[PDB]
Amino acid sequence: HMSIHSGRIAAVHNVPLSVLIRPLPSVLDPAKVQSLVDTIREDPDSVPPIDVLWIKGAQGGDYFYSFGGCHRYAAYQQLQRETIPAKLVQSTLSDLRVYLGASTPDLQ
Template identity: 55%
Template sequence: MSSSQSNNACSSGEPTSIHSASINEIYSIPMKDISRPLPSVLDEKKVLSLMETIQTMDTHLVPPIDVLWYQAPQSGNNYFFSMGGCHRWEAHKRLNSETIRAKLIRTTLNDLKIYLGASLPNLK
């Protein structure tokens, strides 16, 4: 991961998912760098509530999303995938946020193949 992505790491006492419960670091990841390969069914009221919280309160009140992080071994390219956090993601997207707070979960190419099957992009 490049230093521009990791420079906002901080310790967390926030709610976590089972996948990120042991991860303390939170990063500000550029929205444009994260792929969301799964469609979402959204609760509009929840998205609007999150948008209001992000706009009017401390953004740290909104828990970070979990992001699968794969680093291609030969090229060193980083790939980020978010499978959950759809309401938080959508709220940030509608607010044109450049970044979103995230916990990075290292993953392997084999794990990504299981998650994404034939829709896995060519990761070089």
């Protein structure tokens, strides 16, 4: 075998909900939110980590952007949880511009 696979680093962490930037509105099915609440209470390991873009700014500041995972995010909030399991996906400002376009911040 001549080759390896390489990609961005992703690691699951229990991230404080408060650190997550959520620039976009959520599209929520209220019954699906409640279903997740029930599942988180009874069987949390069956609820996957949400994906979060981990971006480092020009001066090394860390920013955690959350797009999607709307139902899980809402369900953790309704449970008043401090943290949520999240896959932190190392990403760039170019990756961020895909979601934020002209409003993409010059992050520091």
